[PDB]
Write an enzyme that holds these catalytic residues in place. Structure first.
Site, mmCIF file in Angstrom:
data_model
loop_
_atom_site.group_PDB
_atom_site.id
_atom_site.type_symbol
_atom_site.label_atom_id
_atom_site.label_comp_id
_atom_site.label_asym_id
_atom_site.label_seq_id
_atom_site.Cartn_x
_atom_site.Cartn_y
_atom_site.Cartn_z
ATOM 1 C CG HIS A 49 2.348 -0.288 5.015
ATOM 2 N ND1 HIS A 49 0.973 -1.209 5.323
ATOM 3 C CD2 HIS A 49 1.735 1.108 5.206
ATOM 4 C CE1 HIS A 49 0.166 -0.434 5.523
ATOM 5 N NE2 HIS A 49 0.691 0.935 5.400
ATOM 6 C CG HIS B 226 -8.521 0.697 18.412
ATOM 7 N ND1 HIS B 226 -7.673 -0.363 18.695
ATOM 8 C CD2 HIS B 226 -9.660 0.638 19.305
ATOM 9 C CE1 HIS B 226 -8.224 -1.002 19.589
ATOM 10 N NE2 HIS B 226 -9.275 -0.624 20.088
ATOM 11 C CG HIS C 160 -2.859 -3.060 3.552
ATOM 12 N ND1 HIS C 160 -3.491 -3.984 4.026
ATOM 13 C CD2 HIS C 160 -3.033 -1.883 3.767
ATOM 14 C CE1 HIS C 160 -4.376 -3.017 4.590
ATOM 15 N NE2 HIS C 160 -3.835 -1.779 4.615
ATOM 16 C CG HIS D 153 -1.781 1.165 1.635
ATOM 17 N ND1 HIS D 153 -2.431 1.890 0.468
ATOM 18 C CD2 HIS D 153 -1.977 2.003 2.693
ATOM 19 C CE1 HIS D 153 -3.015 2.907 0.876
ATOM 20 N NE2 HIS D 153 -2.662 3.119 2.311
ATOM 21 C CG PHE E 62 -11.099 -3.019 14.850
ATOM 22 C CD1 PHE E 62 -12.291 -2.783 14.619
ATOM 23 C CD2 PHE E 62 -10.073 -2.266 15.555
ATOM 24 C CE1 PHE E 62 -13.063 -2.009 15.868
ATOM 25 C CE2 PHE E 62 -11.051 -1.276 16.360
ATOM 26 C CZ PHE E 62 -12.118 -1.219 16.638
ATOM 27 C CG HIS F 59 -5.468 4.420 6.453
ATOM 28 N ND1 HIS F 59 -5.452 5.870 5.911
ATOM 29 C CD2 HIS F 59 -4.569 3.772 5.375
ATOM 30 C CE1 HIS F 59 -4.840 5.851 4.686
ATOM 31 N NE2 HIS F 59 -4.426 4.577 4.330
ATOM 32 C CG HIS G 294 -0.350 5.293 4.715
ATOM 33 N ND1 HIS G 294 -1.126 4.181 5.312
ATOM 34 C CD2 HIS G 294 -0.878 6.791 4.809
ATOM 35 C CE1 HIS G 294 -1.905 5.141 6.367
ATOM 36 N NE2 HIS G 294 -1.801 6.399 5.901
ATOM 37 C CG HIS H 287 -6.744 2.090 2.340
ATOM 38 N ND1 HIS H 287 -5.774 1.763 1.748
ATOM 39 C CD2 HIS H 287 -7.053 2.025 3.472
ATOM 40 C CE1 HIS H 287 -5.306 0.950 2.550
ATOM 41 N NE2 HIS H 287 -5.821 1.282 3.632
ATOM 42 C CG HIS I 165 -6.232 -4.124 17.505
ATOM 43 N ND1 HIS I 165 -5.988 -2.872 17.962
ATOM 44 C CD2 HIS I 165 -5.360 -5.131 18.089
ATOM 45 C CE1 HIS I 165 -5.231 -2.856 19.075
ATOM 46 N NE2 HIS I 165 -5.007 -4.106 19.406
ATOM 47 C CG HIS J 112 -7.676 -0.915 7.965
ATOM 48 N ND1 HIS J 112 -6.526 -1.226 8.262
ATOM 49 C CD2 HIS J 112 -7.470 -0.153 6.709
ATOM 50 C CE1 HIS J 112 -5.469 -0.782 7.577
ATOM 51 N NE2 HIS J 112 -5.941 -0.088 6.680
ATOM 52 C CB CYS J 113 -7.982 -0.458 13.640
ATOM 53 S SG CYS J 113 -6.896 -0.025 14.859
ATOM 54 C CG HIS J 114 -2.536 1.791 9.872
ATOM 55 N ND1 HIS J 114 -1.326 1.039 9.708
ATOM 56 C CD2 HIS J 114 -2.641 2.315 8.563
ATOM 57 C CE1 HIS J 114 -0.831 1.044 8.388
ATOM 58 N NE2 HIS J 114 -1.766 1.700 7.851
ATOM 59 C CB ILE J 115 -3.465 -1.534 16.159
ATOM 60 C CG1 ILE J 115 -3.182 -0.027 16.957
ATOM 61 C CG2 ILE J 115 -2.566 -2.572 17.157
ATOM 62 C CD1 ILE J 115 -4.433 0.082 18.133
HETATM 63 CU CU LIG Z 1 -1.309 2.531 6.048
HETATM 64 CU CU LIG Z 2 -5.198 -0.233 5.431
#
Ligand SMILES: [Cu+2]
Ligand SMILES: [Cu+2]
Ligand SMILES: *[C@@H]1O[C@H](CO)[C@@H](O[C@@H]2O[C@H](CO)[C@@H](O)[C@H](O)[C@H]2NC(C)=O)[C@H](O)[C@H]1NC(C)=O
Ligand SMILES: *[C@@H]1O[C@H](CO)[C@@H](O[C@@H]2O[C@H](CO)[C@@H](O)[C@H](O)[C@H]2NC(C)=O)[C@H](O)[C@H]1NC(C)=O
Length: 496
Positions: free
Chosen positions: A109, A394, A111, A64, A460, A397, A66, A399, A455, A449-452
């Protein structure tokens, strides 16, 4: 330092960013992953050649980019089983997209699953040759990018499901409890010069309270959105966020601690953990011995505004939009939920499902996790925090979009007139009701979605299926993308 046209060869090998050796993921044979740069409006052609052989960290991959809107190129956005099937090992795949109308600090990163935590993650800068803040600084180059990252001595699928970090890495270097003599990152500055430092969180989990002894930071950009300059003496940066700040190197020649305190794991700076070194030219090549002073002017997100003072989409009242959605968080059966659904990656990526004739949210898999959004509209989403979703705060993000943060964590107020816009926002602590608005100007399925990462693996997430009827016509796919799913689906599981 590479890009915007480049090969990115993905492989496995040993790394020791905190003096402890472990296998991880290399990019162009280095760790941490290398900086990619280009200029506003450029076409990036990043050919990801996957040579990974380690199934424990996953042999397949997907990247991705980002923060990039990917308008017309939804197939390049990266999330596995949303926007593509993974690239298979021994294969390459070209991400070919343009970045009209964006400039700032970004990152890339993996994904796929929790793969980026094993080391596939690096910064990206898209320079603006007419940056409206260019006259606030003298230096802005490879040596002013600062990354923050959490680092684990056991791989993501080897340790606990929500592990605690062994070391914070700053520009890929840091100390753990048992490696207190490991090398620290050094950031050099010349007295009298002004620096645009571009701070990017590559974190899989913790947020960092970032400060530099003796120095204020004049924040000028958040998640690739230009801000009115706002000087602070510390700031909290959540996973996948970016800030540019100007540092005026006008203090006495000396070494000063750069501090990045995580919200979990080791929460002090004993022996130089969670730290790096700001060194003025002429200072001794030794550790700082400066002290932290209490932060009395921390960053407050509700106090930030865009350089243009842009209003939030819509009309200045709750629900003042075409479609308002509320995301009710929960956790049951070892899985996170949103409005009672846990995201499980579908075998057919959501984009492909749409291209193959799926017409409604009800048609799209996974059931319960996909939201159809109307075209060319204003949207408002509230993400109220709750203890029912453990591990708050949490960060979420979206997209394909920037959004107005009409209500931030730790604030009770709604700002429709001139809120900050960004693309990752903390949803804060129980009692908060973080509320964002955006415009549906970008046909395609986009992850929210949660960027932890730990999770997200646990479900999540939801998918915004934006303007379904125009997704195919807007996002023509290259034949290499159409060849990803049959290649991947032919792998045996041990080669995934
Ligand atoms: Cu990201
Ligand atoms: Cu994402
Ligand atoms: C594939 O990667 C995994 C995860 O990095 C490596 O796992 C290591 O396994 C050994 C032997 O059990 C343990 O002592 C280590 O603690 C694990 N490392 C990590 C970082 O968790 C594995 O060794 C790699 N495979 C090869 C062939 O190198
Ligand atoms: C978070 O904010 C959302 C949006 O204002 C709240 O959901 C609204 O709740 C009111 C009062 O029940 C309803 O009339 C609206 O229909 C809701 N809107 C939507 C889009 O569902 C939600 O209650 C707030 N949660 C907290 C904890 O304050």
């Amino acid at each position: 330092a590479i890009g915007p046209v480049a090969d990115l060869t993905i492989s496995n090998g040993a790394v020791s960013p905190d003096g402890f050796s472990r296998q991880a993921i290399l990019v162009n044979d280095v760790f941490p992953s290398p900086l990619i740069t280009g200029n506003k409006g450029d076409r990036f052609q990043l050919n990801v050649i996957d040579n990974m052989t380690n199934h424990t960290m996953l042999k397949s991959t997907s990247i991705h980019w980002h923060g990039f809107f990917q308008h017309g190129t939804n197939w390049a956005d990266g999330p596995a089983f949303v926007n593509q099937c993974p690239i298979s090992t021994g294969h390459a795949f070209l991400y070919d997209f343009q970045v009209p109308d964006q400039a700032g600090t970004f990152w890339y990163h993996s994904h796929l699953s929790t793969q980026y935590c094993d080391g596939l993650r690096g910064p990206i800068v898209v320079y603006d040759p007419n940056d409206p803040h260019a006259s606030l600084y003298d230096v802005d180059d490879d040596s002013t990018v600062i990354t923050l990252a959490d680092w684990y001595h056991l791989a993501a699928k080897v340790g606990a499901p929500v592990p605690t970090a062994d070391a914070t890495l700053i520009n890929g270097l840091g100390r753990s409890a048992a490696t207190l003599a490991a090398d620290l990152a050094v950031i050099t500055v010349t007295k009298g010069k002004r620096y645009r430092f571009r701070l990017v969180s590559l974190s899989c989990d913790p947020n960092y309270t970032f400060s530099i002894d003796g120095h204020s930071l004049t924040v000028i950009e958040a998640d690739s959105v230009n801000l009115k300059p706002h000087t602070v003496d510390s700031l909290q940066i959540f996973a996948a966020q970016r800030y540019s700040f100007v540092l005026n190197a006008d203090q006495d020649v000396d070494n000063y601690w750069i501090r990045a305190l995580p919200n979990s794991g080791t929460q002090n700076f004993a022996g130089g953990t969670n730290s790096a070194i700001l060194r003025y030219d002429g200072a001794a090549p030794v550790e700082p011995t400066t002290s932290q002073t209490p932060s009395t002017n921390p960053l407050v997100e509700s106090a930030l505004t865009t350089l243009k003072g842009t209003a939030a989409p819509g009309s200045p009242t709750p629900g003042g939009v075409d479609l308002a959605l509320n995301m009710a968080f929960g956790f049951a059966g070892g899985n996170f939920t949103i409005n009672g659904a846990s995201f499980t990656p579908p075998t057919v990526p959501v984009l492909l499902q749409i291209l193959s004739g799926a017409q409604s949210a009800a048609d799209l898999l996974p059931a319960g996790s996909v939201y159809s959004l109307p075209a060319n509209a204003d949207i408002e989403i509230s993400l109220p925090a709750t203890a029912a979703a453990p591990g708050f705060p949490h960060p979420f993000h979206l997209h394909g979009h920037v959004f107005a943060v009409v209500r931030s964590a730790g604030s009770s107020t709604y700002n429709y007139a001139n809120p900050v816009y960004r693309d990752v926002v903390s949803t804060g602590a129980p009692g908060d009701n973080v509320t964002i608005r955006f415009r549906t100007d970008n046909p395609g399925p986009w992850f929210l979605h949660c960027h932890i990462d730990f999770h997200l693996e646990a479900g999540f997430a939801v998918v915004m299926a934006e303007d379904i009827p125009d997704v195919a016509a807007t996002n023509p796919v290259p034949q290499a993308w159409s060849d990803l799913c049959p290649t991947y689906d032919a792998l045996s599981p041990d080669d995934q």
